[model samples]
Target: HWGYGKHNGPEHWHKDFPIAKGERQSPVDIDTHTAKYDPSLKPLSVSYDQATSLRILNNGHAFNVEFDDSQDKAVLKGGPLDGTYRLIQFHFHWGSLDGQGSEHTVDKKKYAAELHLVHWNTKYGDFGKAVQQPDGLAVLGIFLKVGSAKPGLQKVVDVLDSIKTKGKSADFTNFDPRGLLPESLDYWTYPGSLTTPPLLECVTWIVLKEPISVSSEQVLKFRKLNFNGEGEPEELMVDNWRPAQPLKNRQIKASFK
Candidate 1:
């Protein structure tokens, strides 16, 4: 179930995990020209120290960060609601191969990968309970593209050598995920659901318009993960993106005024 083979592809994920059909998938394409811009949208602020409290976890499928709710201090604004939310876990979805890795696409363009920064409402006390509520979560999306040169993803790639085997993860030390953020924090906000199962529709999606570039070689390395034995057959498991779904009459708001 963890390889780069055909049955192991994203398109086949929902079959294995039936609940995935209802999840709010991501890596959606962002067309700046078409997105509605709101000049009044306020930018959320958080200090680096505030970000370090995140607890990184490896859930077999991906690397996720669990947030310390006791340290709730980040603030968010605009979209359907406005207020402070506690950071939870941040993780990613990648392709079995390298060319396609985004979960949401804009007009059919797939990026090399996608990163999600998950958060929950402090009003709910904790993520476990908050995930059950409709308005209790928020997620920031960042896209990854493959390029000739190595982008700033070297730090992430360095750890791949350790997590190369499936279902295996080690504690990430001295890494600040915020460092991976694009220069422009400007985002597009909308009401959505989690990309994974339980498919709770409690997420306020803040997807960055600008994408970060990673090297093609780095992407190739990711495609090397397998569920079967290492020598059976080289499976290309790098393209882990899910297709974009209907917007369902929801309006997506951008931060560009």
Candidate 2:
């Protein structure tokens, strides 16, 4: 029942999911000037098996591209993670307009959109078990700016029509997510929570410093999707991003100078 609407949005989520106001909430403002540089942090290692992608679906909140986590086919390692984390799914958050949308911001600067590549610790057995632990997940966030069209992203946008309504889905595979990444892998790492409902504080956020390009036309395609299901009052899915939370006592470490 949670939504970005005024009636039952992020502000009301805490009433049901108290963890929403818990320590270490996500999408915090990254003050680059204050973020500490840690030389000990290793370069992020992301190896994806395109065949592992199963399908893409609109789950009322956002369109997620699910991956087969049965094996280590598509896994994320290194960086701030202690071990390997298998890819579970990937989703995006956007705003109603081009000037704002991204969940996390840099020096209070917002992007056109944000991409979340969710992965779970392989050591915890499965995503279900991992979600309970402090180090359960490692989410790689990439900011999206409005400019030229990103071919890697177009493949995803191309399938949006097939899943225009909530609960709609389509077969989406053989797509390498690496193509959507920026040339620089530099990032800011921190402990945070899921930006959505149940906002569990079990994520190690690895937000890339550089942002990828996406045309304004492509972003419009995302806005065309409806938040409502078939036979329901049509509501365009826009401004799905959550605002940045308090930094609290957490530290934001950068991998580069």
Candidate 3:
């Protein structure tokens, strides 16, 4: 299996998934000075319904809060997108310790963790179909910095103990993800791919410039999760982040000057 281990980490992912080296691979190092300012970009608009949230599942890689995407109940619009993108799920990426964890880096500076809100364009009909198209997915990436406790994140941390092992899930409803975002929507937009296995090159990544604060204690709770399943030997889930990839020919556009 492709995991963050010495034998099957990011460097070895290209063998099974050739697209790991694809042109639009994600988590690129964002050079703010080199990023171009685009006036054409519209202000991002996000409206999330607390009722759309279902449960949080520990999928070996990370704990994701799945949402009901049957309709436009919770969606993302504007800011480089042509149409509505429905929220599918949101997950986090973190390290064994603070100082370095985020997949995407700004000016090569890494944060304690990162939150990815995955959404799929309605034009593709569904997430399964959208995954194969270039303009199918739109993800919002929010960086997590170590600071005071974040009430919104605490709601998630409260359930981490129940889902300590892979494949475990518990009721995690009525949660509004909007509370996890920074006050400013200023972001860097680019064409990228999924950071995990399959590494599909079909995402329009919107990485927020501002980072949300979380206590060190909250981050420690995530470390209790196991990448290895219930019966298997315990392997703590930490440092499950893909390193920044090459920028290549793609140009990152900034929503703010």
lDDT value, residue 68 of candidate 2: 80
| lDDT score for candidate 2 against the true structure | 0.93
Q: Which ten residues in a row have the lowest lDDT in candidate 3?
A: 45-54
Candidate 2 lDDT over 1-257, as tens digits, reads 89999988888889999998888998899999999999999899988754377899999989999988887688889999999998889999998999999999999999999999999999999999999999999999999999999988999999999999999999987888877889998999999999998899889999999999999999999999999999999999999999999999999999999
Expressed as tens digits, the lDDT of each residue in 188-218 for candidate 3 is 9999999998999999999999999999999
Model 3 spans with C-alpha error above 4 angstroms: none
Candidates' TM-scores?
0.79, 0.98, 0.98
| Better structure of 1 and 2 per lDDT | 2
Candidate-wise lDDT, in order: 0.64, 0.93, 0.93
- Output the better candidate (1/3) by lDDT: 3
The total number of steric clashes, by the backbone 3 Å criterion, in model 1 comes to 24
- Where does candidate 1 stray beyond 4 Å? 1-33, 53-57, 65-69, 73-81, 96-98, 148-152, 227-237
True lDDT of residue 78, candidate 3: 98
Model 3, C-alpha of 213: deviation from truth (Å): 0.3
lDDT of 2 at 133: 91
